[PDB]
Structure 1
């Protein structure tokens, strides 16, 4: 079936717990595979040690720039950027997992987890999974954001990988 992956997240060095994500490889196999491999680190790089750099309460938590650790970077397993696979899945509510981007066809590694329905992103960001377990952790992360997106604690993906 579809991959299940995990992110273990700290805030200021204290563990918050685990976010488990289903990756909808049935719908967006290329996008799912990228995220899966970045979780395992099997290509020699990935999310381990990277941060949630932009967190906006009542919107989303954004992470995954493991190259510049500032929100301008990240890379995919295919190369620096890859195309928008499709817009078949929608930003339906809290827990949606979607690719950050800098315009059409600029998926890399940055991603976000929604904390509300973000319908205005439909057709612009590729949705590729959702939270299976750990929305409590996501709500904790969210609570350390701000209107500007600046985080008030250092939020780090300490560990990540594939469950199935």
Structure 2
């Protein structure tokens, strides 16, 4: 079946717990595979040690810039950027996992987890999974955001990987 992956997240050096994500490889195999491999680190790079750098309460929590840690960087397992696979899955509510981008066909490694329905992103960001377990952890992360996106605690993915 579809991959299950995890992110273990610290805030100011203390553990919040684990977010478990299902990746919809049935719908978006290329996008799911990128995220899966960045979680395991099997290509020699990935999410381990990187941050949630942009967090906006009542919107989303964004992470995955493991090169610049500020929202300008990241890279995929295919190359620096890759196309929008499809827009078949929608931003239906809290827990949606979707690719951050800088316009059409600029997926790399940055991603976000929604804390509300974000319907205006449909057709612009590729949705590729959802939170299976750990929305409590996501709500903690969310609570350390601000309107500007600046975080009030240092939010770090200390460990990540594949469960199945």
Question: TM-score normalised to the size of structure 2?
Answer: 1.00
- Partner residue of 1:162? 162
* 1:121 Cα deviation from its structure 2 partner: 0.1
* 1:92 Cα deviation from its structure 2 partner: 0.1
Deviations 1:60-111 (A, max 9, x none): 0000000011110000000000000000000000000000000000000000
Does 1:28 find its partner at 2:28? yes
- Partner residue of 1:149? 149
Q: State the distance in 2 between where 1:155 and 1:31 align.
A: 24
Deviations 1:16-45 (A, max 9, x none): 000000000000000000000000000000
Q: Where does structure 1 differ by over 3 angstroms across 4 or more consecutive aligned residues?
A: none
* 1:158 Cα deviation from its structure 2 partner: 0.2
Q: State the distance in 1 between where 2:42 and 2:108 align.
A: 16
Q: State the distance in 2 between where 1:118 and 1:26 align.
A: 22
Gaps of 5+ in 2: none
RMSD between aligned residues = 0.2
Deviations 1:41-66 (A, max 9, x none): 00000000000000000000000000
> What is the aligned length?
164
Gaps of 5+ in 1: none
Q: Secondary structure at the match of 1:39?
A: helix
1:60-71 to structure 2, matched below 5 A, reads: 60-71=60-71
Q: State the distance in 1 between where 2:138 and 2:36 align.
A: 19
* 1:151 Cα deviation from its structure 2 partner: 0.1
Q: Secondary structure at the match of 2:38?
A: helix
